[PDB]
Amino acid sequence: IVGGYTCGANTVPYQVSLNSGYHFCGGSLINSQWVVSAAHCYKSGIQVRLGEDNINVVEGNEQFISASKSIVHPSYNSNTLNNDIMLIKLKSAASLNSRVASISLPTSCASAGTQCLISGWGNTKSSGTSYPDVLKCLKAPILSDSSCKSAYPGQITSNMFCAGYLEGGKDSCQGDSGGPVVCSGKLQGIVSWGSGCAQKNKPGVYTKVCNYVSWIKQTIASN
Amino acid sequence: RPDFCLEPPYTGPCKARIIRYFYNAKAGLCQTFVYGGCRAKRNNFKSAEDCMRTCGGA
Ligand SMILES: CC[C@H](C)[C@H](N)C(=O)N[C@H](C(=O)O)C(C)C
Ligand SMILES: [Ca+2]
């Protein structure tokens, strides 16, 4: 058993690719003009691609739109990775259809053992290298705070959660950062960091999106 | 020239796929590698040229 599977074309319609000449990160569409991603995904000269499946061939459903603005959270800590969230304003509004559609923000935080979908074009090999053409999906449960903090002593803030399997072999990896963790339709997390990928007793760490909902709505409204 | 230039490349713990440069002392040139977005070490350059200017000759 491998973790990922191929989601299927345009089945995660809020997933976006962040491109600077090549896919470097993911992100989620929150409305027709705003994308949420990771702070450590901040670059100049972002192009956002919407409606992707194969990130290497033009399949006719794409919208490539440049960012006008990129806002990293005011309290992003480069060392501790706390507040690893960022908003990207699109140069022009996307056109929302059936392959391009935005994801709802949470009303509350999700509990340990809620099962989520995590999607990405990141590396598919735990130890190794292989970047897929098509988008991969992974169902992984939210982990308890207490286990998270046992997996990574000293490093887990109230703004992080752990998701995956203590056994290993099923995770998110390099390439996947900024992309969604969606649980019961609501966007709970952002792919953020880990100790490697898919290693035993080190599940991935994700930005806890339910803490930021007031910040998102107000930052969106005034920019 | 320096001793951070001899250090193997570090991806770190963040999961971006960002292509950077490092000095490969074994080859005597700068090469690309995948930097995950955070906690970079000093052998980690944004262009071959920055790499060559800082390190080339280590
Ligand atoms: C989250 C997107 C997918 C599932 C990532 N990139 C993946 O392919 N992970 C591998 C797995 O099968 O879960 C993992 C690194 C072995
Ligand atoms: Ca495509």
Three-class SS of chain A: CCCCEECCCCCCCCEEEEECCCEEEEEEECCCCEEEECHHHCCCCCEEEECCCCCCCCCCCCEEEEEEEEEECCCCCCCCCCCCCEEEEECCCCCCCCCCCCCECCCCCCCCCCEEEEEECCCCCCCCCCCCCCCEEEEEEECCHHHHHHHCCCCCCCCEEEECCCCCCCCCCCCCCCCEEEECCEEEEEEEECCCCCCCCCCEEEEEHHHCHHHHHHHHHCC
- Ligand 1 atom nearest the C-alpha of A124 is 8
Ligand nearest to the CA of A4: 1
Cα separation, A17 vs A148, whole angstroms: 28
CB A85, CB A116: distance < 8 Å: no
Cα separation, B27 vs A50, whole angstroms: 40
CB contact under 8 A, A174 and B36: yes
Domain CATH for B56: 4.10.410.10
Cα separation, A126 vs A199, whole angstroms: 7
Task: Determine the residue among A22, A24, A125, A152 to mutate to test chain B binding: the one whose Cβ has the most chain B Cβ atoms within 10 Å.
Answer: A24
The residue annotated as part of the active site, out of A84, A119, A176, A192, is A84
| Alpha carbon separation from A192 to A180, A196, B32, B51, B55 (Å, rounded) | 10, 12, 22, 27, 30
Please tell me whether A62 is known to bind a ligand.
yes
CB contact under 8 A, A24 and B17: yes
CB A69, CB A142: distance < 8 Å: no
Backbone angles phi, psi at A23, to 5 degrees: -60, 120
Q: Which residue of A has its CA nearest to B34?
A: A174
Q: How many domains are there within chain B?
A: 1
Cα separation, B33 vs B18, whole angstroms: 8
Q: Which residue has the tokens 């990574």?
A: A152
- Ligand 1 atom nearest the C-alpha of A135 is 2
Structure token digits, residue A206: 């994700």
The answer to whether domain A1-12+103-210 and domain A13-102+211-223 are alike in fold is yes
C-alpha of A201 from chain center: 21
Half-sphere exposure of A171 (CA within 13 A, CB side): 30
* Residue B57 one-letter amino acid: G
Mark whether A40 is an active-site residue: yes
CB A120, CB A12: distance < 8 Å: no
Cα separation, A151 vs A148, whole angstroms: 5
Quote the ligand 1 centre to A1 CA distance (angstroms): 11
The structural domains of chain A, with segments of one domain joined by +, span 1-12+103-210, 13-102+211-223
Quote the ligand 2 centre to A211 CA distance (angstroms): 33
| Alpha carbon separation from A85 to A78, A155, B9 (Å, rounded) | 11, 17, 26
Which protein residue has the closest C-alpha to ligand 1 atom 12? A3
Please tell me whether A171 is known to bind a ligand.
yes
Q: How far is A18 from chain B (nearest CA, A)?
A: 10
Q: Looking at the complex, does the CB of residue A194 fall below 8 Å from at least one CB of chain B?
A: yes
Question: Does the beta carbon of A177 sit less than 6 angstroms from any atom of ligand 1?
Answer: no
- Ligand 1 atom nearest the C-alpha of A171 is 13
Sign of CA dihedral A123, A128, A133, A138: negative
Q: For the domain bounded by A13-102+211-223, which CATH number is listed?
A: 2.40.10.10
CATH class assigned to A1-12+103-210: mainly beta
Task: Determine the residue among A72, A193, A199 to mutate to test chain B binding: the one whose Cβ has the most chain B Cβ atoms within 10 Å.
Answer: A193
Domain span holding position B30:
1-58
C-alpha of A79 from chain center: 20
CB contact under 8 A, B15 and A191: yes
The DSSP call for residue B58 is -
CB A119, CB A136: distance < 8 Å: yes
Structure token digits, residue A23: 């896919």
